[PDB]
Amino acid sequence: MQKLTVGLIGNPNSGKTTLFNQLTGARQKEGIFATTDHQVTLVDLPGTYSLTTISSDEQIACHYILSGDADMLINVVDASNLERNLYLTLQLLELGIPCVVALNMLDIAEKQQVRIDIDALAARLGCPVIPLVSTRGRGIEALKIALDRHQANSDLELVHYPQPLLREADLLAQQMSAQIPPRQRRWLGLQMLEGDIYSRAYAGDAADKLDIALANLSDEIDDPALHIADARYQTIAAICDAVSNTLT
Amino acid sequence: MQKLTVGLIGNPNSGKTTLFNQLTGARQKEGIFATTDHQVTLVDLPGTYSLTTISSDEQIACHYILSGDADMLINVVDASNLERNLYLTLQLLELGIPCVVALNMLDIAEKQQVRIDIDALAARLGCPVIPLVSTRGRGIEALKIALDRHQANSDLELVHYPQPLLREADLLAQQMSAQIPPRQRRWLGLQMLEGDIYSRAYAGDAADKLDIALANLSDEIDDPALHIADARYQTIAAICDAVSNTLT
């Protein structure tokens, strides 16, 4: 037996607490349950649509995610609203924290005639996708196996960012804290280029080494924030069109 | 042209003889037919739900499988009863004998609104899955190509067994016949730990080096037989939920 700390992260109303209660066998606050190989400390985090805030029940999950307290995340995704839910999923995968997708509410998806190829999605994301109906306890055993087996997400180029955006993000990834892993550093630097207020606190040579970067791009990109978000949305649409019935 | 000996193995009533008659062009007992690269000697084996018997038209297929007479198996699986049929399939894949899944009765599956992602299943099993309707001769040519191309199953950890169970299975895999390949030895040792009566005959330091093993686990596992079977069933459920419409 090894120890694992796992965070439940997902949009508001995606079924995180329901899944929490199922795993921990809660009576009708950290949880603890056993898998085959792990004693898992489980943290139910407040819902969030995104790890980016430009101005402001959480940016609590983000701060929790970046604290290094979690070894792995369970990203709870509502299957009936896939494309909307996948924005947060992509941010987590760009960050590189080991994760498993708990693709929840599949009974609701089925009622609305939504079809998702589970393993196709997993191969596009580079992490396991475990189908669940959390209210029914369906898929929990498979989720527990995936927590014992998953070690690291696949190293995919997920989002296809214009090279000028990555040049200037990577320069910032060179300034900052250096302790903090490269994947996280480039992520922090794109978050900075989007106008995220919380990410400078995690830098090193921190804040407005950003003003040089954001001016180094006027010959190239008009609104970097909009270009970064758009590249993300494009990626998610391409995934949903391939693995789901969303194209038509 | 090379020679191949192929066994047809599957549950009772899965379409083995029908497929046999199609491949051999039998008139309305070993068969022989040509693929592009092989002269195939085909053996129609008696149906079985499982290669485990704790007390007792076959354990004939099992004895045939373990004799080394077959180079490859065609595992004939009834698509309309996937989860039930996959128990035998998993045993064959744990054994490691080269195999191809002939996913038969897909017309019946379709009538009962069963949807199976063929290549997703193949990637989860680690061997080719060839969709058939054997009564219609549909898929036979693709099956023949797969017999020429398939060499070895992928080396996947299929079933996620508690480590104490594998410790004690592997010790037995150390005793026995040593001629007999490691994959087959660990398989024989888990079969022993489940109470299979036929597997001691295939050991070496044979039988009740099992009593030491089965007592070496009372600090850990209550009923090893039940724990092994459950791990298997869990694996199969996880596969069917991902690649089929069984979750909901």
Added chain:
Amino acid sequence: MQKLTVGLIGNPNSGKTTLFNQLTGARQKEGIFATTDHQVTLVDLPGTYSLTTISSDEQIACHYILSGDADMLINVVDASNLERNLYLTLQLLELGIPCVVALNMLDIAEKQQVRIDIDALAARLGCPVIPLVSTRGRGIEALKIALDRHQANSDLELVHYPQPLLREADLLAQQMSAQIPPRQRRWLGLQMLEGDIYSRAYAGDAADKLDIALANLSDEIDDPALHIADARYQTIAAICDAVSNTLT
């Protein structure tokens, strides 16, 4: 920014010009448009069902393909007639020119109850498959990302040809122009063995080093042309049965 020359190739009436107009933003003849990384010169080629003619709006596309003018192809495939469209696709993949499948008319496929697993098809073909509805501009952004990311098709044995056919094709691949890459040479040699009239012009030791080859096979294959075509059709049927609802 790098330069790319891309040919649009596909059967008559598969939506090539529609896709051309969408990419180039044509007003209601080469095009030019930007992707993230490339300035793409786009060539709308005349439709063709096949790159083989034994006797004779094109063999223009074939001559264009073999000229080396295109860096990459977009193979425009009508999803509502997959199996028929895939004959040309296979020829292109056997040739080895970098390509992306634009799986078009998916709205029509959906109306006729056709289901295609997009990523399963991509893995069977060894190149990206981008789902489109070209009249709606749906999927164009994902297509543009794929043109920036795709470098080389996967090196799969697609079609399972009787070894005598490949022996004699490869001997011819030894004669010819030697400048011309091995994959293209074997392709030219199978085209010769099928009776293609245009391929001798691209040989070296050219034409009727074919008469020796075609007589070197009477102990083995009756009609090599029919055997080659059949192997191709078999391959396509096997693909469609796995990734589409065509088996039953």
